[PDB]
Amino acid sequence: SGFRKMAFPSGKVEGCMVQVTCGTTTLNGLWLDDVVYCPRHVICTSEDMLNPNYEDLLIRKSNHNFLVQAGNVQLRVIGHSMQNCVLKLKVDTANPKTPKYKFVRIQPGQTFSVLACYNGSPSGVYQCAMRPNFTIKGSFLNGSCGSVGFNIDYDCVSFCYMHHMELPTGVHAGTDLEGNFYGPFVDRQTAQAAGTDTTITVNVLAWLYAAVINGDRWFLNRFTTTLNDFNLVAMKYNYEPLTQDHVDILGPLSAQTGIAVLDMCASLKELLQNGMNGRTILGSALLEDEFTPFDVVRQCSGV
Amino acid sequence: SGFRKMAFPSGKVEGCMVQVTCGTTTLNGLWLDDVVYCPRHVICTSEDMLNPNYEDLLIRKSNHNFLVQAGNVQLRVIGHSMQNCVLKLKVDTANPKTPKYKFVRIQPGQTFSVLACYNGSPSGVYQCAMRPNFTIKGSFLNGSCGSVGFNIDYDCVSFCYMHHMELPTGVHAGTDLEGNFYGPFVDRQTAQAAGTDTTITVNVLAWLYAAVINGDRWFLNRFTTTLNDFNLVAMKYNYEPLTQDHVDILGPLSAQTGIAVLDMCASLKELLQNGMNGRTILGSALLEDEFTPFDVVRQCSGVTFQGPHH
Ligand SMILES: O=C1O[C@H]([C@@H](O)CO)C(O)=C1O
Ligand SMILES: O=C1O[C@H]([C@@H](O)CO)C(O)=C1O
């Protein structure tokens, strides 16, 4: 029992983190086989980031301009190419600690673990979710660029995020491991607007189900609601629309607890209108939306 | 910027987790050098946990009754001894992945990362704190016993907790790596009450300091209070007393922010009585108390630890 923001073990990812330096700019790289992936803005200074032209800044660079350090063994760069917003540096040595891995692009609402790194050294691991506006509310300091987000599906490490930027409002943007940003963001220091951030409804319900599995039941009620009847209320409170797909996804949690999805939907709606009245659910005074239904299954059952 | 429940990188500890099976009971063990540490109740069945005598159940076992599996090597047990509530099994092979380690007993209020394990395979890592009532608010399922809690200095893993049981209120109890339980709990299926839990005051102040580092300053005021005057108000709200020691520990955060500890205490006093008035601090509507002053300093300063590339 008990419920925690649980991250995956970071060992398999620790063995892939390297330091990539270009000029006076240093950030982290992902070393899989004989390729090192890192944000392409490693070739920029601070003044450069105001309006960088990556076409030009890369043509001016050679293999010897990239200093890659794995621990403090220096990896020799033998090639370089740009794929969207990530730089791919081929080195002369394959990473002996490369795990079974896969490059995936996640949907908003899905969660993943982040291994925060500085100078290629691990600092901490934590869980977060891809917001509906394609930002993430992470913890990143200067030098953290190139840190990766990942899930471990059984034995395969699914890399899904590479950190690139901190926007002026404090949230963070990045790409998949093919270099395509999540959301409308670009690797330039400029005014960039995110979409309205909304709450991940299906995650709140999954988390409400985790609460009931853990003995928190005070928010259950006797009303019942439907699909259209739930969504008309949800979006006044900036909640994502709940689909029949979601209702199926919550099925296993419904069965484990014996409370139908539409019963639970009536409860949340109630919490939306009246508030929590000084009470708590799973140690929180807010409705948590960064646990997927799968996440609840791992902690309360086991995938 | 940003602030998160950050756990230590778990790589160095992942290489030490093994599966320990005795009879029909399977739980996790910690394999350091040629010794495997695990909870001693691996030798009990459900019928034995009602009122076990571990001296007896252990005398009726010998080395071949303990099956230890590391990955897909079967470790051969060549000795077994009991130290308080942990069982120590010597194996014929030293763990090649042993790091600097240390067995420490932590104080209530201190935090550590837990590597949740099942069948000797790590499943997840999360941060938590030793509650003042010597429980921990963990996340553990059946088979998780033997999971360990730890801190990392730089390359040294300080082991401080081994999981043993879930209390009926859903919280968890365990021992240090010498087998001594934290708190008044015992490894027998019996009536056990944890007791009233209090809020870790010095941790809340550390987290308030983290907030101001991150740009959240709305709770600051012009007042200062005295340790005695703050504690009179705090302890009416089920808060741990704040000592001169605590005030010292917060010194570095005070210097970094330019806010005296007793100034921050004046802010906390207000938040305790009036609430947050529909606002949030670091994305939370509650006062967080599971970040130590040290936890705030490294996360806000980006302290790193030794990776696997020597
Ligand atoms: O999160 C951030 O990303 C950039 C980069 O400098 C970090 O490597 C920055 O300034 C942050 O605060
Ligand atoms: O923490 C726990 O201890 C018991 C034990 O049966 C697991 O081995 C249990 O089910 C937990 O959740």
Side-chain angles (χ1 to χ4, degrees), chain B residues 29-273:
Chain B
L30 188 74
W31 180 24
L32 299 168
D33 300 317
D34 63 343
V35 180
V36 174
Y37 308 79
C38 75
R40 78 176 168 175
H41 75 92
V42 65
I43 85 182
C44 299
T45 50
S46 303
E47 124 221 56
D48 295 312
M49 283 303 272
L50 286 176
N51 180 238
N53 191 303
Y54 289 93
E55 186 170 8
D56 277 335
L57 311 162
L58 186 53
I59 285 172
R60 316 168 171 152
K61 310 272 162 178
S62 69
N63 300 324
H64 84 279
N65 289 134
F66 300 95
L67 178 141
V68 184
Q69 314 212 39
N72 292 288
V73 310
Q74 189 162 138
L75 287 188
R76 187 169 101 89
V77 177
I78 67 166
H80 63 266
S81 54
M82 173 163 45
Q83 187 186 2
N84 303 297
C85 291
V86 298
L87 175 74
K88 296 197 288 207
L89 312 166
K90 186 180 289 293
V91 287
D92 61 354
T93 317
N95 186 7
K97 302 174 163 303
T98 311
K100 255 196 69 186
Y101 69 89
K102 214 182 191 163
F103 291 170
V104 306
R105 183 172 185 86
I106 55 171
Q107 316 308 140
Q110 291 196 284
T111 62
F112 53 96
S113 299
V114 168
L115 179 64
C117 287
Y118 301 89
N119 312 289
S121 297
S123 76
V125 61
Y126 58 89
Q127 194 76 350
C128 60
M130 177 64 73
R131 301 306 313 172
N133 64 359
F134 295 99
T135 63
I136 73 167
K137 290 177 176 289
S139 177
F140 293 118
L141 288 191
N142 219 38
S144 74
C145 299
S147 293
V148 310
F150 62 95
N151 284 269
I152 307 180
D153 190 273
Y154 160 81
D155 57 350
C156 174
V157 186
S158 277
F159 292 107
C160 63
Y161 176 86
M162 180 172 267
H163 181 58
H164 277 70
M165 58 188 65
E166 188 188 299
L167 292 194
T169 55
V171 289
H172 304 98
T175 75
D176 53 38
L177 270 293
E178 276 171 352
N180 300 308
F181 265 87
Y182 290 99
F185 314 110
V186 291
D187 48 3
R188 60 182 285 266
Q189 166 78 359
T190 191
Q192 306 192 65
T196 270
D197 185 26
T198 56
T199 298
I200 308 150
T201 308
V202 63
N203 281 7
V204 179
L205 293 162
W207 175 75
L208 286 182
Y209 273 118
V212 310
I213 291 170
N214 264 267
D216 261 311
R217 301 180 61 95
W218 60 265
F219 47 83
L220 299 174
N221 58 30
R222 66 183 132 117
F223 298 121
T224 305
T225 187
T226 71
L227 259 188
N228 296 331
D229 286 345
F230 168 87
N231 286 319
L232 303 164
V233 175
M235 297 159 82
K236 292 190 180 180
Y237 286 93
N238 223 35
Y239 266 52
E240 281 293 297
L242 195 81
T243 75
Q244 185 48 55
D245 299 86
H246 298 138
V247 175
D248 298 330
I249 319 295
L250 291 161
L253 284 164
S254 189
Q256 180 174 168
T257 62
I259 308 159
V261 185
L262 300 176
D263 282 1
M264 197 52 104
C265 284
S267 298
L268 180 46
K269 198 197 280 203
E270 306 304 304
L271 286 165
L272 277 153
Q273 300 167 290

Side-chain angles (χ1 to χ4, degrees), chain A residues 1-12 14-17 31 70-73 95 97 115-118 121-129 137-141 166 170 172 280 283-286 290 298-302, chain B residues 1-12 14 115-116 118 122-129 136-141 166-167 169-172 280 283-286 290 298-310:
Chain A
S1 81
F3 209 71
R4 287 262 180 202
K5 274 211 193 90
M6 210 178 277
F8 287 99
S10 63
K12 282 174 190 223
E14 286 174 55
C16 306
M17 304 298 320
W31 181 24
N72 263 314
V73 168
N95 185 352
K97 288 151 172 133
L115 180 64
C117 289
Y118 298 93
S121 279
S123 176
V125 54
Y126 58 84
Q127 189 83 347
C128 61
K137 294 179 182 294
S139 169
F140 295 114
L141 289 161
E166 180 169 73
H172 307 107
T280 285
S284 177
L286 299 169
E290 305 218 343
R298 260 186 48 229
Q299 268 201 53
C300 313
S301 300
Chain B
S1 71
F3 209 71
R4 282 272 187 183
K5 287 289 186 63
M6 207 169 290
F8 286 95
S10 64
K12 288 188 189 317
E14 289 163 49
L115 179 64
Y118 301 89
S123 76
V125 61
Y126 58 89
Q127 194 76 350
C128 60
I136 73 167
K137 290 177 176 289
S139 177
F140 293 118
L141 288 191
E166 188 188 299
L167 292 194
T169 55
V171 289
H172 304 98
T280 62
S284 164
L286 299 180
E290 292 209 344
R298 63 176 174 89
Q299 183 179 162
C300 294
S301 300
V303 160
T304 52
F305 307 85
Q306 206 206 33
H309 301 117
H310 153 59

